[PDB]
DNA sequence: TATATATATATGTGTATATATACACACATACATATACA
DNA sequence: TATATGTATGTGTGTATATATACACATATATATATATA
């Protein structure tokens, strides 16, 4: 078997080495008859266009290779290259230089190793790059190759490690790939997973692994596909998933909406989706050597494949949530808030927030904080804000649930009524609080926007007792520290 | 087995030259249909062979190539 | 991209909401365009010539879209928006 | 640069209406989560 | 495939807490909109 694929990229030199059986170290008869000299199989495999083991591909074959061209394309864009291959009895070293113009005779020794290695220097200058590569070009190319290796690591079998510059490549699952691609747009997000199986051979031999993230902050539909090892960017497998998800999304949208008239299409359905699809599909064809786009009849998937309904349901749920949210996000985007001049800056912890109870109270406080020279030792708006408590605070102690998970911890999940309270949303957005934080350390207690909340309430028994106790109860129930 | 091919057999077996050599779903496939003295561009919702359309296309673009090549000339 | 930049400008102008952010899909999903002509120096991604290859800046440096066309287009699109 | 639109703001004394929160408890409507199975 | 079974919402009463909005009327000013000039 192939137990490893070592890829490296350093000082411009690019190398790739695998450890299955090597390329046959043997004389090629017809190639030698053509060349009128002794030609061995690796020289045909690396220097003879339209040559390889896939000239006659089977309908069930899931290798990317088909044309007998790719390797010679690598050689033709190499200033120098070294093919090394060993079959357990011999090792074979051949040097192929000057864009396939100089093909040195090979050197054949005994060896008991078994592997194939291609090592080469591209013609970076001829291809538009600096010589040697600039800092930015080098970093860009390393990042791109590193990405391709991660993709291999998800596509390759489970006995095969993918190395890039000697470190192993982490991402052995489509979920790992999804998390990698969405680490910034949508960290800590929900990953819908599916294994799409078929019932008839050959398709039943090759399940498609799928991971999808669904986020409101995704601007367009997006997929990553590794099919037959090829990072292709267009193909009817994507459309299969898109159309299936859309049909379910339309059904449940018209169900959930009591408007019952609006008509959404695939762009609405899918623009918040990021999908990774990895696996093998037998019998596909491409639109060129690059293999950017696979070619197939759509019905292959309609006849043979089924997307598990749990995945479809999860996906439709997330998408229809976003749809209704987007319809009513305009009414979410008017509180009474006077920002202090130094709120959220370098002296943000020097600042107070005088949370008053109504609007007449804010009239009093704004009268008081503007005595400019009648109160030279008083406060002012350089370190003091104002906000309205909106009457009486909602309590959270009657509107929250401690639910027990599997690991042995009770997480405290709120209510949809408490979540949508306009007053408490205001003070959370003003103070910059976070619900999953705990603020035990001072490194966390300096990430806020003010230094203290100060309740300027009435002194009658209603305002002094009730809403001040409910404000204390809110802060105790969520952040006692 | 390692095989060496010629252009001819290669082009008959391999999709890199003109696209797929059998019927596949071609996204955006269109055709012109006449409806009572009106030309309409309509979708063709049926699989077709990309290589088959390419052999028409190759000749047609050769002809329009000749047209551009000669447009500032005498003949 | 050119049509989108103009569409975003005039959408924020015409809207007195003044907060909503639209992208290229919103800008362009109601457009059907035909583009015909010659471009010197292009390259392709294969024999089929499905995709032409070029530096984007070729157009940023050399070409200009007439403003009357951009204005007409932006008007129609913002009406729909 | 010009003549020309059509909408837009503010003042006092008037005409009409809207809406958020607390607090207790009997009662009504919505699943949904199992448990025999089937 | 029916059954319970433990979950979650949901108005409703009196006495409290804090707000919101449409319209008429005269006249001076305004800031961008518009022809056609070219």
Author numbering:
A (entry chain B): 78 to 410, 415 to 562
B (entry chain A): 3 to 77
C (entry chain A): 320 to 400
From the primary publication:
One intriguing example is the African swine fever virus, which stands as the sole mammalian-infecting virus encoding a type II topoisomerase. The ORF P1192R encodes a functional Topo II (pP1192R) which is highly conserved across diverse ASFV isolates. Prior extensive structural and biochemical studies have elucidated key aspects of Topo II catalytic mechanisms. These structures have unveiled the inherent architecture of Topo II, which is characterized by two principal heart-shaped functional domains: the ATPase domain, responsible for ATP hydrolysis to fuel the molecular machinery, and the central domain, which interacts with the DNA duplex and contains a catalytic tyrosine residue that cleaves the DNA duplex. As a result, Topo II not only relaxes DNA supercoiling but also disentangles knots and catenates potentially detrimental to cellular function if left unresolved.
In parallel, the full-length pP1192R was mixed with 52 bp DNA oligonucleotides, Mg2+ and AMPPNP, which was subsequently plunged-frozen on an amorphous alloy film (R1.2/1.3, Au, 300 mesh) at the same concentration. During the course of cryo-EM image processing from the dataset, we determined three distinct full-length pP1192R structures, each characterized by a unique orientation of the ATPase domain in relation to the central domain: pP1192RF1, pP1192RF2, and pP1192RF3. The atomic model of pP1192R-DNA complex encompasses a homodimer of the GHKL, Transducer, TOPRIM, WHD, Tower and Coiled-Coil subdomains, alongside a curving DNA duplex. A pliable short linker (aa 410-420) interconnects these two domains, accounting for the wobbling of the ATPase domain. Collaboratively, the TOPRIM, WHD and Tower subdomains constitute a positively charged DNA binding groove that accommodates a DNA duplex. The DNA duplex engages in an extensive interaction with the DNA binding groove of pP1192R. Meanwhile, the Tower subdomain presents an additional β-hairpin, referred to as wing-2 (847-860). This wing-2 motif adeptly intercalates itself amidst the base stacks of the bound DNA, facilitating a global DNA bending of ~150° and a localized DNA conformational transition from the B-form to the A-form. However, the ATPase domain retains a flexible conformation, which likely correlates with the energy transfer dynamics intrinsic to the DNA cleavage/stand passage process. In the full-length structures, a continuous wobbling characterizes the ATPase domain, suggesting a plausible correlation between the rotation of the ATPase domain and the oscillatory behavior of the central domain9.
